[PDB]
């Protein structure tokens, strides 16, 4: 018999060496993030609306949008109050930060990502800056009970198509288990000014076969 612990103490001493190796394994880069997986799956994922989307230049308003608005009049059947008027900017963008740019890249991509981020920022800034005008120019096509939600959806969808394009372009950058710290912080402060833009966007709302468009609504809401 040997009741003293020293045996197991030596056992722990042996174990200790593994520690750093195990931790590095636990910190290595991952295969693909489920967030971008979901995004890419949902894109083209239902009833060809994603292929209906052809508007472009990411810097425009009502680009002949009345054509789709005609079918949105039918969509007005649905309870578009399920659409959030806020834009989960940071939340949706978060998966995009899982990239050590020192690897899986020439470290150049950072600049393109920052440019795209500022582009989105200015996009939403102009949208808020002219929403009322946008209200009037789309009410040209007929009032609806939820024209606010319809315009918000139009903005979101318009962006999201280009977002899809941007992802398919910068495809297969391999995600880290963790977001980039610096890029994440920049994102955070950008989202600070974004939410401040939401606040500035003081307004009042105008107030099932959803299961397809319900997917898009969830995605806009960052449901997971």
């Amino acid at each position: 018999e040997d009741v003293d612990y020293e045996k197991e103490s030596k056992r722990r001493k042996l174990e200790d060496e593994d520690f750093l190796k195990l931790k590095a394994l636990e910190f290595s880069k991952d295969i693909v993030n489920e967030k971008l997986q979901k995004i890419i799956v949902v894109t083209d994922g239902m009833k060809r609306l994603y292929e209906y989307c052809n508007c472009k230049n990411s810097l425009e308003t009502l680009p002949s949008a009345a054509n789709y608005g005609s079918l949105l009049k039918r969509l007005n059947l649905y309870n578009l109050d399920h659409i959030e008027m806020n834009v989960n900017f940071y939340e949706l963008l978060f998966p995009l930060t899982l990239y050590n740019d020192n690897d899986n890249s020439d470290k150049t991509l950072s600049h393109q990502l920052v440019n795209y981020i500022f582009l989105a920022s200015n996009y939403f800034q102009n949208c808020a800056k002219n929403f009322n005008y946008m209200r009037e120019t789309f009410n040209v096509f007929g009032p609806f009970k939820q024209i606010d939600f319809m315009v918000m959806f139009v903005i979101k969808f318009n962006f999201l198509c280009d977002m899809r394009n941007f992802a398919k372009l910068i495809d297969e950058l391999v995600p880290n288990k963790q977001p980039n710290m610096r890029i994440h912080s920049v994102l955070v402060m950008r989202d600070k000014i974004v939410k401040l833009a939401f606040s500035n966007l003081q307004f009042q709302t105008f107030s099932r076969n959803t299961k397809h468009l319900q997917r898009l609504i969830m995605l806009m809401n960052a449901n997971y």
Binding site: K13, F19, K23, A24, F27, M181, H184
Partner: protein
């Protein structure tokens, strides 16, 4: 203060990273299992490196930054058995607890945690890391660790930096985080620090208090540390007087070199006396002027020990008042003066001479 009843602390340096595994679903008596779980953290930064999916045992998991409120402040905190709660390396006292006994997993013993149910699962890490400061550099983002994971493994010379606004507690936290991983590393990486360090030396004193707090239950580890001014200036000067083949040579070198001769000469080096002399506290202690902390020093099989002040018999108070006294016929002022005058004449010296008799202790 104390930990309120039904809370326990697990300290382990390994907990510097979140030990997702260990936690288990708490339940109330009556098997009222509580899959609701909340965790409090110093920062959302912490949350960034925590995976929900680790916890399929639970269906309900949320995490927030701790905030030390006012109104609920109590020795006895609020209770809420409806959810399990954990705090991860908390800095400041907690106001609310979860189902059953709550448990906290932390690396550092705060004063708040003094009288507490505690476990440490400590193990000895041998490899002491080191500082070096020449004034190539590894630059570090001196807070986020995993930013520099593998970097710290690979390189061994790292810069340390802060923005002004940091709370002292946050500084202490991050620093403590460093040294654990460094002792896990296989080589003595060299710290470089961009700070005037004086108050940092003060928090090092605080580390001393903390580590003693550990030692109340701890490993009695051979933990390397040092005074950082009163030591270092004098050590630098001593080497300077010496030949300086390696200005970078570790102190412990000199230490053990001197150690080689102790037993053969059975006496204390002036070097080691100046150590335990010129610390603020663990010394003669200029804080209070307490050379009374003489070193009684013993070695295997000895019938006797070496004091700061000569050989002593074992386990006795440095000198018996009863003695073969330095009887004043010796060390009489008169004879002292006479001999001193002889000396002065012989030297032809005007000034700067003083004399004193020897004195003796237990042994002569």
């Amino acid at each position: 203060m104390e930990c309120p009843f039904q809370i326990q602390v697990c300290i382990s340096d390994r907990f510097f990273a979140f030990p997702h595994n260990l936690v288990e679903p708490q339940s109330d008596v009556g098997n009222k299992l509580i899959e609701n779980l909340i965790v409090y953290v110093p920062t959302d930064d912490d949350r960034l490196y925590i995976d929900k999916k680790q916890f399929p045992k639970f269906n309900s998991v949320l995490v927030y930054r701790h905030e030390h409120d006012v109104n609920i402040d109590s020795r006895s905190p609020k209770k809420t058995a409806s959810a399990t709660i954990v705090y991860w390396n908390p800095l400041v006292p907690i106001t609310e607890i979860g189902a059953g006994e709550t448990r906290v997993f932390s690396v550092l013993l705060t004063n708040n945690l003094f009288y507490c149910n505690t476990m440490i699962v400590h193990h000895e890490n041998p490899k002491c890391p080191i500082e070096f400061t020449y004034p190539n550099l590894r630059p570090i983002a001196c807070e986020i660790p995993l930013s520099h994971f593998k970097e710290l493994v690979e390189s061994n010379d790292f810069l340390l930096c802060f923005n002004l606004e940091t709370s002292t507690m946050v500084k202490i936290l991050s620093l403590k985080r460093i040294f654990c991983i460094f002792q896990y590393r296989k080589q003595p990486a060299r710290y470089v620090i961009n700070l005037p360090h004086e108050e940092i030396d003060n928090l090092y004193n605080k580390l001393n208090w903390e580590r003693t707090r550990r030692l109340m239950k701890g490993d009695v580890p051979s933990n390397c540390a040092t005074v950082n001014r009163s030591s270092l200036k004098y050590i630098k000067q001593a080497q300077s007087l010496l030949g300086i083949p390696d200005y970078s040579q570790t102190v412990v070198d000199f230490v053990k070199m001197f150690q080689k001769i102790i037993f053969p000469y059975q006496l204390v080096p002036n070097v080691i006396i100046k150590l335990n002399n010129f610390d603020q506290m663990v010394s003669s202690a200029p804080n209070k002027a307490e050379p009374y902390k003489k070193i009684r020093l013993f070695c295997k099989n000895d019938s006797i020990a070496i004091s700061s002040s000569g050989i002593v018999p074992i386990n006795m108070p440095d000198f018996s008042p009863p003695n073969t006294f330095d009887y004043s016929d010796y060390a009489n002022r008169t004879n002292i003066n006479f001999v001193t005058q002889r000396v002065l004449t012989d030297g032809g010296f005007s000034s700067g001479i003083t004399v004193t008799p020897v004195k003796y202790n237990y042994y002569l």
